């Protein structure tokens, strides 16, 4: 018999992104080659099969720094991290290959799906 | 020029609620009289003006335990905590007064709004 507030989930995510911009309660640094990205472990787990696996691990859950595979593109990661916190994906001709490869590595199935559909339309 | 995934914010919130149920990465206990509620500080801040104020405070931000005013009803808090993590509000005739008073204390304006409208319709 519950009632539901339609905009609640979007409002929560907007405030989680505000916390990220202000660097409040961030508990991990993701290192992608020469670049660093601060984030909330809970948000990363909620969006990515890879981070969900990493942060449920009894040893890795306590790490303050996570280094990604050297093949991962920093811009691709940045675009996906922005997507995690906003639901918006900056998908462009110049970045689609890097975004799709990063999404496959991060196990973000909906992003992989759309990257596949956008590439198929161009061939 | 971004594209947007409609269900993303709802999917994030569902996984944050799964983390709460499994007690993963919870970093605070909210004490309401004889009852205890584990939660994520980031979610509490994202939903409540009161917790936003508390956890941006340079001293309170590091506390693992927060005690609420003894006038706060544990059931009212439980209903609001469930709302924070799901967008669903279990608003009933028997609990509406406690829910509205708790929402005013927690500074959850949209919940206060609806409680006011539901009481006005019954008078």
């Amino acid at each position: 018999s519950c009632i539901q507030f339609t905009r609640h989930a979007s409002d929560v995510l907007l405030n989680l992104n505000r916390l990220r911009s202000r660097d409040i309660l961030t508990d991990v640094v993701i290192v992608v080659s020469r670049e660093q990205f601060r984030a909330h472990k809970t948000v990363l787990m909620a969006c990515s099969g890879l981070f969900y696996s990493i942060f449920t691990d009894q040893l890795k859950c306590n790490l303050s720094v996570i280094n990604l595979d050297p093949e991962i593109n920093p811009e691709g990661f940045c675009i996906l991290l922005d997507f995690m916190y906003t639901s918006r994906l900056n998908l462009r001709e110049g970045n689609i290959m890097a975004v799709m490869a990063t999404a496959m590595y991060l196990q973000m199935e909906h992003v992989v799906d759309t990257c596949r559909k956008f590439i198929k339309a161009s061939e | 020029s971004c594209i947007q995934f409609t269900r993303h914010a709802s999917d994030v919130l569902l996984n944050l609620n799964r983390l709460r149920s499994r007690d993963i990465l919870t970093d605070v206990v909210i004490v309401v009289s004889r009852e205890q509620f584990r939660a994520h500080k980031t979610v509490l801040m994202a939903c409540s003006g009161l917790f936003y104020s508390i956890f941006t405070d340079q001293l309170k931000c590091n506390l693992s335990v927060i005690n609420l005013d003894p006038e706060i009803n544990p059931e009212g808090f439980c209903i609001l905590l469930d709302f924070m993590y799901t967008s669903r509000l279990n608003l009933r005739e028997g609990n509406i007064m406690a829910v509205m008073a708790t929402a005013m204390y927690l500074q959850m304006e949209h919940v206060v709004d609806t409680c006011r409208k539901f009481i006005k319709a019954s008078e």
Binding site: I3, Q4 | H110
Partner: peptide, 4 residues
């Protein structure tokens, strides 16, 4: 607010 809606009936879900």
């Amino acid at each position: 607010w809606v009936i879900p």
